[model samples]
Target: ASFIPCPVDTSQVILPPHLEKIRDRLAENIHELWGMNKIELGWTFGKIRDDNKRQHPCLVEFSKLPETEKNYNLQMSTETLKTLLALGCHIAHVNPAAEEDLKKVKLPKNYMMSNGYKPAPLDLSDVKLLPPQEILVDKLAENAHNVWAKDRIKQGWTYGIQQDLKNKRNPRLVPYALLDERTKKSNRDSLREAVRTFVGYGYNIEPSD
Candidate 1:
């Protein structure tokens, strides 16, 4: 897997060179606040073989060396599990607001929505909307932890100073799943507090309530 940097255009955003060429092209008449509109755009794409047209999974694994050996430069330390937990909490705080704000906005008809244009409707007429509140909060907390772990792992691989390790193998950066579980349980209250503070709701409050 390769890390591709993409710029968010209010008008248009394109995928990486190879993926854009192979997969598909963006729709035309693209104007009206499209794109992620920030520097946070990211994508994982697999390269297709020119002759055989083979494809592979869109995942990467991290080098199994010490932090320094891997030149793992992270926003914080992964040595201590608590650091990852804190980072997860921070992510939860930010992502919730983003998700909530995006939900509130109404897009134009021509604008493509995500996953078959299925935005979470404000009306709860759909029975699918009955997920537990605690579950939602926990989901956010869990995802936040995963994102933090993935981010740190990605950063370490991308910015390492170890010359010999550079481009030696495929990028197999694995996420810290076990660490996430431990941290979420340990810092559940903290994550809950963050959600409450950000959304003006009680920590770990039930969605039904």
Candidate 2:
């Protein structure tokens, strides 16, 4: 019944097959970058323990690594490209005309990119549900109706028995305390969804007490 949208709405950008090649290249580089730093600190191949026994087995070429390990690196590459696209930044084969402008001039550090005009659905396959604690549920429930009340007030509205368009009328626009049991129950229903949605977006919830 009430809602808002994310500021950056780049949900429509899909990665082309060519970008997969770039992702793979970046994935390989990830191992090299990680491996380079690991060995520089006297790490070597031998024991699996990460203690004084700098005997690390990951020194082998990336091809010899486990599938999960490879995917871990691969995800890093793919996630990075996805972020750039989501932020409305364009990436392509460098055009000399565009390339020359970068080399010849300094772009403003605060310059920001823009998002697409179209609305698109985001894939939520990866939302990590870190369920909220009991206290958090109560705390948020208290504020949920408070926020809804503010929206009504901003439109110069208040509790009304009639349609009251002439006087700015609304039934649910009244104070949370005076609401009927069923009305309060609806807000509580929405409050539970609100508490769990932090987990829906891969975010954590902490208890106030």
Candidate 3:
């Protein structure tokens, strides 16, 4: 009934020569992303990889999952899971039987309760805003783009290009000259034409009140 650690191949992970320095950098970034204090991030990561044997959520083993719900819950692709994990996400394995027996599952007392899941609201308030640090962005984009640049473009990186807009999440994209003004303007014009053509199809045109 206890959680088991997953067997991960960490040999391939390109840890910098000073592993402690890189770990500190990762800890800082994780804290910035999750709105947690530095101490919390350090404690969480330390527990996850702790040599002292403490239960951690990230190290879930498939053997620990219920046979009945195993296949149903293990729907995420390995690549997707890897990406999410790399970005510091942890998925929980819930046991309905144990929850039923306990009468109430132990959960964060301050956790916001909600019924149905929906896309997180897109608003500036809910987001953590950081000033543009070109150096950091360049480093991140260079590292991330190295493996997936081609796949990212092949999928739809082009569609995100804009003259004045920069993706808040990854701003190193500014240096991608191929996606700058000319291409964005051309594509935008083309899309405008398409929208104009489609406007005759009973689309409601609302004017700002």
Candidate 4:
């Protein structure tokens, strides 16, 4: 359940003659290169149905293999391709001259031929800047109480029971408003700085009244 199922069923699937031919050739090359039995290599690489039979390396849940086994399979497969290439086998049916050229050409860093092309990185520098005060008001409106409480805590506000002589039980609360003027000013400055930081990061602010 942890691994995604391979969408294509390697078993019970039909292939065109050309593809099947190359697949057979690849299996033979893999067998010779890895010194594995030809029959065992065919079963490992191609479709074969027998539920009660011993599990061959045909398409199954990839997570079923242990780390060592997975690495071995990957190494063998890669070597098989390199073997075929060295033998001048045109896997893609490309012209012999073009195939030679392809072998000589150097691929780009992180180049993946399967996905065809890589997209350019994203750019956000073109976004227009807005005033900090406007941005602050907008952010505050979205969650004023949560932001206020967080800022108040930064100014040394602590949660404690209210001491009312008339009341039997004291209620727990953050005494932000009861803090000294200097502490309140410090909290306010922090909130303003936070607003400016958000604006710098391209957050839009509400227009001031």
Candidate 5:
């Protein structure tokens, strides 16, 4: 086996309040993705670790995860931000004034609004997104499923053979593995659109290593 490499010494650097907020937000995303990947490997929630059953108890949302698990995700974002600061990098908004100006623009009635109410004239005709890492897509789709399930649970919904709004029942409330590929494909396409929108705003995701 190979020896573990030493991580960057971020002990000396500290994130400011704003950057600390950013780190926390990113930490939530990291936890969501980590949980998704674990579930992807046929893992499920359990009282404790079970290698044979591929189960653990940390499948809940980031806020509900154990302190140790939460700290682990927070460290990921913290180290990355610390490294950026150590490398003499500065992060800030590109042009807040320009953004405000755009916000003040008066769009004509129903100008960019779609028939189905999808606004924003985001015509991705020539816009093509680079192939994101497969794991990223998988994690995002899993998040979609989780969010939907959470919302449904809040609405007193339960699984049924068919949807029964009166009784708040739906069959799609199962785990990600039991979901129809078509349903999951919808989530994938949505995430693709999400990535494209960020690119349209002059933002892009980059791999660390």
Candidate 6:
């Protein structure tokens, strides 16, 4: 996109002879300044009507100027100068500091580049494998409560006692005294059983010393 300065309607402004001369001189000065600064100018050509005379004026950089008339010096018609002033077609200079900053800027890595290369299998030789028992323990720890409760139910442990409002009693939970202790059942034995059950469900558990 080209940058245009404040645009004005040239057709609306009346140009007197003296004012027209000043405007033409101003266009010449601007052209010379841009040339001295080594700035590039983009020119476009079109016909202009001035005082019933049709003249070809080429727009050089930001100024509309008639190709050196009879004299060798640059000259422009009042109407042409007005059109160029309204158009305002000058290029702005880029800051050297900004350019330096841009040069120092670092861009982030592009993940898309990885698409061209296949990923190699990760090296797991440095990683030690867990012992079978410890692995089991870690797995059982995740569902210890559930495993213990399920085992208790399977072994005929009562859930609780259910009594009706009419005084009729139904024993839902088996009393501890009623539980078989032939195998020397104890709290420690129940814990061991829970661990065994967890292992049976395909989880490793730490071995008791």
RMSD of each: 19.0, 22.1, 23.0, 26.4, 16.7, 41.6
Candidate of highest lDDT: 5
Candidate 4 regions exceeding 4 Å error are: 1-176, 207-209
Q: How much is the lDDT of residue 80 in candidate 6?
A: 35
Per-model TM-score, in order, reads 0.25, 0.40, 0.21, 0.20, 0.43, 0.19
lDDT of each: 0.30, 0.50, 0.29, 0.35, 0.56, 0.33
Better of 1 and 5 by lDDT: 5
- Please provide, for model 2 over 33-119, each residue's C-alpha lDDT reduced to its tens digit, 9 standing for 90 to 100: 455456556665653646477766666666777889999988756654554455444555433242222211122322111211111
Q: Over the full model, what C-alpha lDDT does candidate 4 score relative to the true structure?
A: 0.35
State the lDDT of candidate 1 residue by residue for 1-209, as single tens digits: 24332211112322223322111111100101112121012322134313232221211222222455233322111221222222232112223333243222344443232223312112111212223534544565555555544554565544223333645332223232334355557556443333333233111223322
**Candidate 6 on 14-76: residue-level lDDT in tens?**
544534434433344334433322212222223442333322142233322334531223333
Q: Which segments of model 1 are wrong by more than 4 Å?
A: 1-131, 157-177, 180-182, 196-209
Local lDDT at 56 for model 1: 19
Model 2 clash pairs are none
For candidate 5, write residues 1-209 as lDDT tens digits: 12122333457987877656656655664555455456556666667778898766666666666789889878866765565555454644343342222221233453222222111234434447665534445655665576567677777887788997899988788777678989888768655544443343443344344
Residue pairs with backbone atoms closer than 3 Å in model 4 (clashes)? 134-205, 134-206, 135-205
What number of backbone clashes does candidate 1 have, counting pairs of residues 3 or more apart or in separate chains?
Answer: 8
Backbone clash count, each prediction separately? 8, 0, 0, 3, 0, 7
In model 5, the runs with Cα more than 4 Å from the true position are: 1-9, 95-209
Predicted candidate 4 versus true structure: per-residue lDDT over 94-122, tens digit per residue? 33242122211123444221223221211
Top candidate on TM-score is 5
